[PDB]
């Protein structure tokens, strides 16, 4: 039963939310291999734990840059939340620690690369292929939302493909635990819900809007609302006029009309039946939800990888050194990290 799993999951989450783990490793235990990704706020590097040979992805955040960009609270949210959750399609936080200059989060490595890469190269996914990924997001959001968490940054760039072809959601930089309403303008423009951009105050329903954007993008190969500059994208979003490509099935079109619903009183995921209106939709009729959860469904795409520590599914980035000051920077701002 789903409900009995959720209550046993909320009891584990809460215990770790109230008493977070801190300082579980040090930098000198890790060999730095390669930069896998860069960010507004920081960089992610492939790292090897020397004593075990285990490979991890390490997010490094420069504390001074975090303060400048006013992300202190979001960064504390990210680590606090990540160390407390456990779910098959969320990346596992293994270790976290900090030094004089930086914050570090050492996570599970997914060698299949970002969904983003495979999507742009291939052009678009078949409906069955899109659906396999979408169902994993549906369940992940069912779990997250039951803990009062809003995710707020769904996009192909933050979905990694693991060795079996399944998804790991990474980057919880905008995740927040909220009962009720919140107001921050944050996210990625193409994935912003109209509520967010109109400054109305919003809730977990924004994530169901973004699932709509994601399914559309996966299946079409481009997002439903695009333009060269953000302000143009916001215009189209609030107007809420969507065109579907010819090749979308009518079941797909109907699910998407319910997810990309501007009026949050008619948006799927936000009605009296909640996540069940999505899971019971005709577009998901072939989906065995428990089999996805147990990962017993064979994946339509399994990425080719020659050994652990292989990075060929990732783009190349410019390598920078990790500089560590001899004086502690922003001690009291990150004391709880």
């Amino acid at each position: 039963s789903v409900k009995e799993f959720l209550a046993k999951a909320k009891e584990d989450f809460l215990k770790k939310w109230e008493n977070p783990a801190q300082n579980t490793a040090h930098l000198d235990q890790f060999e730095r291999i390669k930069t896998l990704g860069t960010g507004s706020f920081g960089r992610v590097m492939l790292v090897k734990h020397m004593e075990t040979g285990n490979h991890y992805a390490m997010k490094i955040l420069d504390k001074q840059k975090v303060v400048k960009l006013k992300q202190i609270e979001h960064t504390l949210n990210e680590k606090r939340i990540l160390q407390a959750v456990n779910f098959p399609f969320l990346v596992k936080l293994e270790f976290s620690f900090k030094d004089n200059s930086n914050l570090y989060m050492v996570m599970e490595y997914a060698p299949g690369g970002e969904m983003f890469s495979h999507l742009r190269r291939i052009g678009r996914f078949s409906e069955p292929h899109a659906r396999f990924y979408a169902a994993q997001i549906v369940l992940t959001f069912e779990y997250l939302h039951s803990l009062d968490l809003i995710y707020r940054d769904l996009k192909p760039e933050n979905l990694m493909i693991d060795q079996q072809g399944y998804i790991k959601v990474t980057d919880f930089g905008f995740a927040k635990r909220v009962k009720g309403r919140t107001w921050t303008l944050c996210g990625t423009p193409e994935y912003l819900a109209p509520e967010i951009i109109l400054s109305k105050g919003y809730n977990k329903a924004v994530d169901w809007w973004a699932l709509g954007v994601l399914i559309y993008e996966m299946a079409a190969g481009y997002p439903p609302f695009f333009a060269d500059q953000p302000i143009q994208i916001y215009e189209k979003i609030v107007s809420g006029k969507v065109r579907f490509p010819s090749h979308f099935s009518s079941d797909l079109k109907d699910l998407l009309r319910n997810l990309l619903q501007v009026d949050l009183t008619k948006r799927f995921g936000n009605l009296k039946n909640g996540v069940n209106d999505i899971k019971n939709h005709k577009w998901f009729a072939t989906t065995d939800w428990i089999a996805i959860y147990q990962r017993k469904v064979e994946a339509p795409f399994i990425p080719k990888f020659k050994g652990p520590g292989d990075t060929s599914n990732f783009d190349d980035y410019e390598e920078e050194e990790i500089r560590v000051s001899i004086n502690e920077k922003c001690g009291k701002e990150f004391s709880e990290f």
Binding site: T184, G187, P189, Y222, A227, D228
Partner: peptide, 20 residues
């Protein structure tokens, strides 16, 4: 085509999040 308009746009690479 919409595809051709997307590919000609400035938003086909990794998209960075905005902050407040």
């Amino acid at each position: 085509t919409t595809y051709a308009d997307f590919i000609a746009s400035g938003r086909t690479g990794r998209r960075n999040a905005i902050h407040d």
